[PDB]
Structure formats: C-alpha cells, structure tokens
Design goal:
The structure is cut from a larger assembly and holds two copies of chain A (337 residues). Chain A is an alpha+beta fold and 337 residues long. The first copy, chain A, has ten helices and 16 strands. In chain A, helix 4 packs across helix 6. The longest helix of chain A is centred in the last third of the chain and has 16 residues. The PDB classes it as hydrolase/rna.
C-alpha cells in the first residue's frame, strides 16, 4: 500500500473535560478550586552541586546547598468537610472510522472502507469496544486520583438507552478484571451499544460518566497540568469560579489506553502509531520493528486477503489489526507530504 | 454559446455568520468563548519517523519519537451547567439570478435570462427551493456540531411571513427525509416563499434561523477554523466578548450542498463549476466529462430548445438544467479572458 499525500481520519471517541465537583454532607455540590502556593524546597537538583561527567561544583559548597529555593506550584485538595468528590464528563462513540475524513487517492480509500468492514465481520467490534469501555467504567480517566483513594464509583448514563443508570460501585474491590465487568447486568447492553456505534454508518453512543470518589481527609487532587509556576493546573470556570479539570485530551489518552499488543507486551499503552511509553520514554512499535502503524498500514491489502479467507487468522495478525483499527479510531493524518 | 469576456452573477443565497450562544437553565444567553490550550501530542506524523519511499529516518530513534511535541489549539466547548447551545443566523434568498450582474454580450445575457424564464415556467423552482431549504431546516450549517448531539431544533422565522414561527424539532429523529419535511404544516408555505423570491423580479425571502442544540456535558463545539497555533478558530465579538462562529461562506457552502447530480452520483456536493469534493479531494464534473458548468453552459441554447418543446424533458437534461440554475444561484464570474 502506498501512503497517499492526503489521508486523514476523524476521531471516533470524543471525550469531554472532566469537571471536578465537591459533594458535602448536605449533598450540595460546589466546583473544586485550586490555589497557588509557594514552597521552600531544598537544593536537590543534581545540576546544582554536580557538574556533568560526575564533577562536584566547587562554588556549590556546604554553605550554598543550604539556601533553599522557592518554587511556586498550584495546589488543589479536597476541602475538609467534603463528603466526596464528583468527576463528571461525557464521551461519545461515533462511526467516524468507517470512511476516512480525507483521501486524495480513492484506491487507498477502498482498501480502508473495506478493511473496517471485513474487520467487523470476521473479528467483531466487541474486543476494542470492551477495552475502550473498561477504561470508562473503571476509573482510568481519573488518572492518579484513584491511586490513593478509598473507593470510586462510576455511574454511567448511555444516551440511546432505555433502562436505569448503569453503576459500577467500589471499582477497587469488585471490578478488578474484564470478567468482573462482564458480570454486570448492564455490561453487555453497553458494549453492544458501542459496537453498534462503530458499525452503523451514522449511529453514535453518548455516555455521561460520573465518578463519586471518596478520598481521604484533605486529600490532594491531581488534575491535568498546562504546558510550558513549576506546576500550573489546567482549569475551566464553573459557576463563575475557576476549577481544575482533567483535560479532554488527557481523558481521551486515558480511555484509549488499550494497546497491549506489541513486542514484550507488558501493560496497556496509549494507541499511537509508534507505541510510545510515556513513563519509560522508549517507544515500542518503533518503525525499525515491523509494528508501527505505518508499517502495518502498508500491509493493509495483505490483511484484507487474510480476513477475506475462511480460516480464522493467527492471533498475531489479529492483534496487529486490532492495533490498526484502534489507531483508526484515534484518528489523525495518515499521510506523508 | 462562447463564453463572454465579462459575465458575472451576484449570488442569491446570502447567509450570515452563525453566532453561537450558551443558554443556561435559567434561560439567559451568553456567547460561547474559546481559549487557546497547549496540548502535548506524541510524535505521530509519518514524516517524523519515515522518509518518502518508506525509508525509516535514522535520527528518529525510539527516544526521538518519545519526545512529546507541543501543539497550541483553540478549544471551544459547551460550559458545564449550560442548558443548551443556540446557533443563530439569517439567510436571504433573492432573485439575483434572473439577470446576469454583468454581461458585455447582449446575446449571452438574453439567452440566459430566457433560459432562467424557461426553467421557471417548465421545471418550477420547487426543486432547487426545497433542496436549498432542507439544508436550512435540518441542521446542515451546523456542520460537525450535530454529529454527536442529543437533539437539535431549527426554529425558522421568514420575513415576508404572516403566521407563527416554523419549528423543526428533534431533526435527528423526526425530519430525516424530504417527505418528513413536507409533512410540516408550514413547509409548503416556505418552499413557495423561496420560489417566489426566485421568481418575482425584485422580491426576496429573508429567513432567520435559530437552532437549539443539546450537546452532552462539556461537549466540544466545532466552529470554523481560520486560514493559516495548529487550530485557530474563526470568531466574532458578541457582547464585547470573542465568540467562535461558522463563517458566512461555510454556512453558504452548507446550504448549497445540494449537487447530487453528477456522474456516479453518491452524496450531495457543494454546487461548483467543476464539482469538487473535499473529502476525496478529486473533482467530479471535471471538464473531461460533459458535466462541468462551462460545458453545460456552452449548451445553453440546446437547453432552451429542449425546454421550449412541449414534451417533458429527460431526467438527465433536467439534472443538467438543475445544476446550471444552482450554479447561477451561487453566482460568480463565468468569463474567460
């Protein structure tokens, strides 16, 4: 397959900013608020006392590393009398991966608007839909706030939905796996809706997610920081007062942490062309290995002929095409100018 | 009909910028406002790791693709507690297609005025009028905003009007086809108003449209970008506050995406000389097919003698006639120096 000079995809999952609210014992709600603090940190930086090649700076004497340095940081935390903290956002699944947003070459358009179809026919949407939905239903958009917490509950409201709200209580204890999610009475009724929103050419599935998070006393809340204080928070204005948020793109990067299929598959990565592990920077699915998205998109017709056959393919190629479809769902410009 | 050196038409469909408002549950309106966020994307471009002809860049090491590249984007979204988002504009239909705005050739001018008159008498305006009006009455000028939306209602107040204002509720469900629009009690009284603005020599039909759009919480709004951040919104200043808008020409392209008449007709295109598609960039109605505007305008006398006959014309020639009159409604300079 040749990479056309104009090939864009539009994202299928659209998540919204996670508004943070504080719920008091009288069950009234009030948006969180962060305030800028100034800290007197120690001279802990290695570049201060040390030079490169392991050389101690001579001016940085035992008198110099004494004088602490001030750093201004934003600071947010659950107020004292707060019963819990709510976290609300919305996420819409649409079928914007069926057809490319742009394609200057129609030949490469048929091999994609068919790749998706033969995918859904042979290897249904249930895998990616379930993976995307687990991150919705287990707090993963609540990135680190769920790390040191008592319990967080995901109350979920699907839009083209008939029954009552679908809850996920104490995710730390019950919903610790895929099967524990499946055991929910309404789990299948939701993965079905997501996989419908992916097949139907103009269908969608809007979820409104609301996490009640029981943090300890005065517990520090971690919202998203802004890009280049040594810690500036990303905020909206609710009720006319500023309030921290986990950004829409942070939430999207959270929901789209399904990519576990790669060499030395260890834990889910955010779906991207070259699977970039943000913590240990080295990106897996480097182009030097045959696992980046542009090397597996080059083999799109090979995957067409593999799924068009009668036999169910190998798990290797089915995981490769899972990653292909997840990268299509992420959207983006699959082009090279 | 050889193309004169001066032949311009003034447009007939004059739409305005789509002002965005946020209607709060207390029923007060405040214009939207966007702010320039700065995202940390990954190294996602194909050009960053691959050279042309599929050659992996050597300096694009695993740690080289790890670095997150900043991207400043304008973000607009519905505020948290907003009841909904209103979208208001005004579109005026006029008979600025009857006579050419400028025509240095008295023969080409009269052979087009006679063409428009024969069109009006033979194949009435109720075909382009209803298609132009459907794009107004179903949110189509709300380009991507109605994609992931609970509902949208188009309330439409015609200017030379006598009754009550014309509602089009829950268009995602109710008004999904042409007959669904025709079932409106005021639909005929509006398509006739449009076809009277096109027939009467100096009459006009001013419509004021207001679409209440029910998005999910914090739902991202997609207004028009500007022509080059990485995404700069096109905005006005409502109430002294910058507010994103859909440009007048974006809204005009929306109302005039009626050209479903072309070789391998699939879905409606924006009425243009050589009907270009922006999704699959290639241009239908290329001059190599006899469907471009200057190839079916060169045959204006043929359509005169066809519509002058008593028999009902073919559907193919009547589609050519439709495209011709729609492209005259769009206006422009049909000249060749």
């Amino acid at each position: 397959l040749k990479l056309p000079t104009n090939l864009a995809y539009e994202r299928s999952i659209d998540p919204s900013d996670v508004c943070f609210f504080v719920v008091w014992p009288d069950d009234r709600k009030t948006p969180l608020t962060y305030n800028s603090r100034t800290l007197l940190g120690q001279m802990e930086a290695a570049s201060l006392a040390y030079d490169v090649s392991g050389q101690p700076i001579k001016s940085a004497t035992a008198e110099a590393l004494a004088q602490g340095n001030p750093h201004q940081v934003d600071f947010c935390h659950v107020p004292y009398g707060a019963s819990h903290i709510e976290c609300s956002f919305s996420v819409s699944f649409s079928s914007e991966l069926r057809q490319p947003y742009k394609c200057n070459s129609s030949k490469v358009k048929q091999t994609l608007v068919q790749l998706v179809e033969l995918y859904e026919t042979k290897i249904g949407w249930t895998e990616l839909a379930t993976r995307y939905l687990m991150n919705i239903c287990n707090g993963k958009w609540l990135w680190k706030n769920t790390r040191k917490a008592y319990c967080w509950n995901i109350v979920l409201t699907p839009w083209p939905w008939n029954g009552e709200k679908v809850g996920f209580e104490d995710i730390r204890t019950n919903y610790t796996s895929r099967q524990d999610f499946k055991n929910n009475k309404n789990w299948s009724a939701i993965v079905e809706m997501i996989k419908t929103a992916f097949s139907s050419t103009d269908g969608l599935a809007i979820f409104e997610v609301r996490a009640t998070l029981h943090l300890p006393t005065n517990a520090m809340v971690r919202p998203s920081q802004v890009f280049t204080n040594s810690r500036v928070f990303q905020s909206t204005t609710i009720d006319g007062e500023r309030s921290p948020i986990l950004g829409a793109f942070k939430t999207g990067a959270a929901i789209a942490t399904i990519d576990d299929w790669y060499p030395e598959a260890t834990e889910p990565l955010r779906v991207g062309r070259f699977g970039v592990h943000r913590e240990d920077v080295t990106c897996y699915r480097h182009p030097s290995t045959g696992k980046d998205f542009f090397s597996i998109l080059q083999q799109a017709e090979h995957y067409i002929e593999v799924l068009s056959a009668n036999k169910t393919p190998a798990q290797e190629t089915i995981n490769d095409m899972h990653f292909l479809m997840a990268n299509l769902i992420k959207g983006g410009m699959f082009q090279h100018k």
